[PDB]
């Protein structure tokens, strides 16, 4: 009863226009008709615009750091015209014990080292030296991994969506898919002012994956949102933080790192939580706050800005590129956990020849990766 615009047909309909969404659709552009279908007014309201986002490596897992690793060419040297300045700034991560945990450490040390031959096993002084707020008896060691960066995501996801529009492809905000249909041979996705039909769905659709699965009659994945908030506040008059690394606790109890000429704090938490507009819990600021306060001669006066984002996992803690079993046309890029910006590049070169049953790149297969590692149907015996 209500008017409707006629159906708009595609070659694959992309829901979410996130970093997983826009970096899947940039690399799909060139080679069909990409439409991306997002919810909210804006492309990275959710996750993508809530991480101050990282990379490393030297550090989530076997699948994880092949991804991530695999990324960093195109970050450093991406196509002429893809963005203005340097996606990456240089930014070392320095891991410090706090729990007198040496084993750990070590560990931690030699599994990082096999992937970045520069990782570097710190004593408590070496640490100090390098953040000299730091309280020495709270510090057994570190590790130091001279080869992190900062991503400057806006720019990062602002290209990746530029590419999809320069190849003639739609991003189309403020159409969330109500319902998701198979009908005739292709998915059918209303949205609130008409429907879009293609072969090809790729649910990107972040912490709300598994919700676009149950508008499909998909078998969902069991992703599971995490909270995490994160925290911006002044350091004290006299301290010249702008250089410090990115410091973590060996326990992931918090981390703190440079945020311009302002810090970055955080809990580093993973409370589960349903997927929504996700909003700090003053009990998070409140614990990462005590937790700096405790580690360092800092102390934080009121914080100015403070904000939470969702982080969502399967059960193995690994990214998911690949087909559904079983459900024609409907592909998963989810469970992108605290790394979908660091191995947007790959994962989005991956999932795009795999939507294309095209085999992944020799560069991306280099680096460790296959198509088995990235399926969804690793999560099923
Ligand atoms: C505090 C914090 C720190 C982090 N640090 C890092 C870091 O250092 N490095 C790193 O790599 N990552 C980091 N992350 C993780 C990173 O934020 C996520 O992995 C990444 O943003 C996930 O991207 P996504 O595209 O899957 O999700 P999102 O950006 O949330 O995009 C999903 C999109 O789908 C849309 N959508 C949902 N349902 C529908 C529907 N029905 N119709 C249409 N659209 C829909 C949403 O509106 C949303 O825009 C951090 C995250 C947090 C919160
Ligand atoms: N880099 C580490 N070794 N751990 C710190 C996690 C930072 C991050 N990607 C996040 O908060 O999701």
């Given at each position: 009863?209500?008017?409707?615009?006629?159906?708009?047909?595609?070659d694959?309909?992309?829901?979410?226009?996130?970093?997983?969404?826009?970096?899947?659709?940039?690399?799909?552009?060139?080679?069909?008709?990409?439409?991306?279908?997002?919810?909210?007014?804006?492309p990275?309201?959710?996750?993508?615009?809530?991480?101050?986002?990282?990379?490393?490596?030297?550090?989530?897992?076997?699948?994880?750091?092949?991804?991530?690793?695999?990324?960093?060419?195109?970050?450093?040297?991406?196509?002429?015209?893809?963005?203005?300045?340097?996606?990456?700034?240089p930014?070392?991560?320095?891991v410090?014990?706090?729990?007198?945990?040496?084993?750990?450490?070590?560990?931690?040390?030699?599994?990082?080292?096999?992937?970045?031959?520069?990782?570097?096993?710190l004593?408590?002084e070496?640490?100090?030296?390098?953040?000299?707020?730091?309280?020495?008896?709270?510090?057994?060691?570190?590790?130091?991994?001279?080869?992190?960066?900062?991503?400057?995501?806006?720019?990062?996801?602002?290209?990746?969506?530029?590419?999809?529009r320069?190849?003639?492809?739609?991003?189309?905000?403020?159409?969330?898919?109500?319902?998701?249909?198979?009908?005739?041979?292709?998915?059918?996705?209303?949205?609130?002012?008409?429907?879009?039909?293609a072969?090809?769905?790729?649910?990107?659709?972040?912490?709300?994956?598994?919700?676009?699965?149950?508008?499909?009659?998909?078998?969902?994945?069991?992703?599971?949102?995490?909270?995490?908030?994160?925290?911006?506040?002044?350091?004290?008059?006299?301290?010249?933080?702008?250089?410090?690394?990115?410091?973590?606790?060996?326990?992931?109890?918090?981390?703190?790192?440079?945020?311009?000429?302002?810090?970055?704090?955080?809990?580093?938490?993973?409370?589960?939580?349903?997927?929504?507009?996700?909003?700090?819990?003053?009990?998070?600021?409140?614990?990462?706050?005590?937790?700096?306060?405790?580690?360092?001669?800092?102390?934080?006066?009121?914080?100015?800005?403070?904000?939470?984002?969702?982080?969502?996992?399967?059960?193995?803690?690994?990214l998911?590129?690949?087909?559904?079993?079983?459900?024609?046309?409907?592909?998963?890029?989810?469970?992108?956990?605290?790394?979908?910006?660091?191995?947007?590049?790959?994962?989005?070169?991956?999932?795009?020849?795999?939507?294309?049953?095209?085999?992944?790149?020799?560069?991306?297969?280099?680096?460790?990766?296959?198509?088995?590692?990235?399926?969804?149907?690793?999560?099923?015996?």
């Amino acid at each position: 009863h209500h008017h409707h615009h006629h159906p708009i047909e595609a070659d694959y309909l992309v829901i979410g226009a996130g970093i997983a969404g826009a970096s899947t659709g940039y690399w799909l552009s060139a080679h069909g008709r990409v439409v991306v279908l997002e919810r909210e007014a804006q492309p990275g309201y959710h996750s993508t615009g809530r991480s101050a986002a990282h990379y490393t490596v030297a550090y989530g897992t076997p699948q994880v750091r092949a991804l991530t690793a695999a990324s960093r060419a195109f970050f450093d040297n991406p196509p002429a015209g893809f963005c203005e300045h340097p996606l990456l700034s240089p930014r070392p991560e320095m891991v410090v014990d706090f729990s007198d945990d040496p084993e750990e450490l070590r560990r931690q040390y030699e599994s990082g080292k096999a992937l970045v031959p520069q990782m570097r096993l710190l004593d408590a002084e070496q640490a100090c030296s390098i953040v000299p707020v730091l309280r020495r008896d709270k510090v057994f060691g570190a590790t130091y991994d001279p080869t992190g960066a900062d991503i400057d995501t806006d720019a990062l996801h602002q290209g990746y969506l530029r590419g999809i529009r320069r190849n003639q492809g739609q991003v189309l905000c403020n159409h969330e898919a109500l319902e998701i249909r198979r009908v005739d041979g292709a998915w059918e996705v209303r949205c609130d002012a008409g429907s879009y039909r293609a072969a090809v769905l790729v649910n990107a659709a972040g912490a709300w994956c598994d919700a676009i699965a149950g508008l499909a009659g998909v078998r969902p994945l069991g992703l599971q949102p995490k909270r995490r908030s994160a925290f911006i506040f002044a350091p004290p008059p006299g301290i010249d933080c702008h250089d410090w690394p990115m410091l973590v606790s060996l326990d992931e109890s918090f981390y703190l790192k440079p945020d311009a000429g302002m810090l970055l704090g955080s809990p580093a938490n993973a409370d589960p939580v349903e997927a929504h507009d996700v909003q700090p819990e003053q009990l998070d600021i409140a614990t990462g706050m005590y937790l700096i306060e405790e580690a360092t001669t800092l102390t934080i006066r009121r914080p100015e800005h403070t904000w939470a984002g969702l982080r969502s996992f399967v059960a193995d803690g690994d990214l998911v590129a690949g087909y559904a079993a079983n459900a024609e046309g409907f592909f998963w890029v989810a469970a992108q956990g605290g790394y979908g910006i660091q191995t947007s590049a790959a994962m989005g070169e991956a999932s795009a020849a795999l939507i294309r049953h095209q085999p992944l790149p020799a560069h991306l297969r280099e680096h460790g990766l296959d198509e088995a590692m990235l399926s969804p149907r690793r999560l099923s015996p």
